[PDB]
Ligand SMILES: CN(C)C(=O)c1cnn(C)c1C(=O)Nc1ccc2[nH]c(-c3ccccc3)nc2c1
Ligand SMILES: [Mg+2]
C-alpha cells in the first residue's frame with residue numbers, strides 16, 4: 001500500500017498556504033483532494049478504490065452554475081485542510097476524516113438559489129425542510145452517495161464511529177447556513193472573553209467546527225486580490241440570476257440580487273466584509289490563533305474594496 005500522491009513542486013509548496021488557488025485544470029482537482037486527505041488524516045484512513053469512486057460521484061452531483069460548483073467544493077476542502085494542518089493536535093482521527101468530506105459535499109446539487117427563493121417559489125424541498133432548506137438537502141445527497149455500492153468510504157469503522165462521523169458531517173454541513181453563523185459567532189465571542197470556552201465540551205467543539213465551516217465557505221475573501229475580484233464576478237452572476245427569478249414571481253429583489261444596482265457592488269462588499277467576513281475570521285483567530293493569515297488576507301481585500309470606491313481602480 002505504497003502509492004503516495006505527489007504534486008508538482010509549486011503546488012506541493014503553495015498547497016500548504018491558506019491563499020492557495022486550485023487552478024483551472026478540473027482533472028487535477030481529485031488528485032489535489034486525495035493528497036490533502038493523505039497528508040491530513042494518513043494514507044491508511046480510506047481505501048483508495050472506494051475514495052476515488054466517492055469523489056467522482058460527488059463531482060457528478062455538483063451542477064454547472066457560476067459559483068456553487070465543484071471548484072467551490074474543492075476550494076472549501078482545501079481551506080479546511082490548511083486549518084487542520086496548522087492546528088495538528090486539536091482534532092480527533094474522526095474529525096479530520098469527517099470535515100474534509102463535509103467540505104467536499106457541503107453544497108451537493110446546488111442550483112444557485114438561496115433558501116429564501118425556494119420559500120417564495122414554494123419548492124418541494126421547502127415543504128420537506130422549513131429551515132436550512134438547501135443544507136438539509138446537501139446532507140441528504142451526501143448520505144445517498146455513501147449508500148451506493150462500492151462507495152462506503154467508512155466501511156472499516158464500527159457501527160459507533162460510523163454514527164459519530166455522520167453526525168460531524170451533518171452539523172458541519174448545516175452550519176454552512178449563513179443565517180445560523182451570526183448567533184453561532186455571537187455565542188463563541190462571549191464564551192471566549194468570559195473564559196468559559198472548553199474544547200472537551202462537545203457542545204463547544206460543534207460551535208467551533210461550525211465557525212471553521214463558515215470560514216472555509218467564505219474563503220474567496222482570504223485569497224490574493226485578483227482571485228477575490230474574479231470570484232466576486234461568479235458570486236454576483238448567481239445573485240443576479242436569482243433576482244431575475246424573483247422579478248418573475250412579481251417580487252422586487254434585495255439590491256445584492258438586483259443586476260440594475262451593479263454600480264453599488266463595491267459599497268455592498270464593504271458591508272459584507274464589515275458585517276460578516278472580518279468578524280468571522282477575527283473570532284476564529286481568537287479560538288485558533290494559527291488561522292491568523294485568513295484574517296490578515298481578509299483585511300487586505302477589505303482595503304482593496306475601499307480602493308475601488310475611491311476611483312484608484
Ligand atoms: C451568500 N454568499 C455566498 C455570500 O454572501 C458571499 C460569500 N462570499 N462572498 C464574497 C459573498 C458576498 O459577496 N456576499 C454579499 C453580501 C451582501 C451584499 N450586498 C451586496 C450589494 C448591496 C447593494 C448593492 C450591490 C450589492 N452585495 C453583497 C454580497
Ligand atoms: Mg451552501
Ligand SMILES: [Zn+2]
Pocket residue numbers: 068072076106107176217
Ligand atoms: Zn459553499
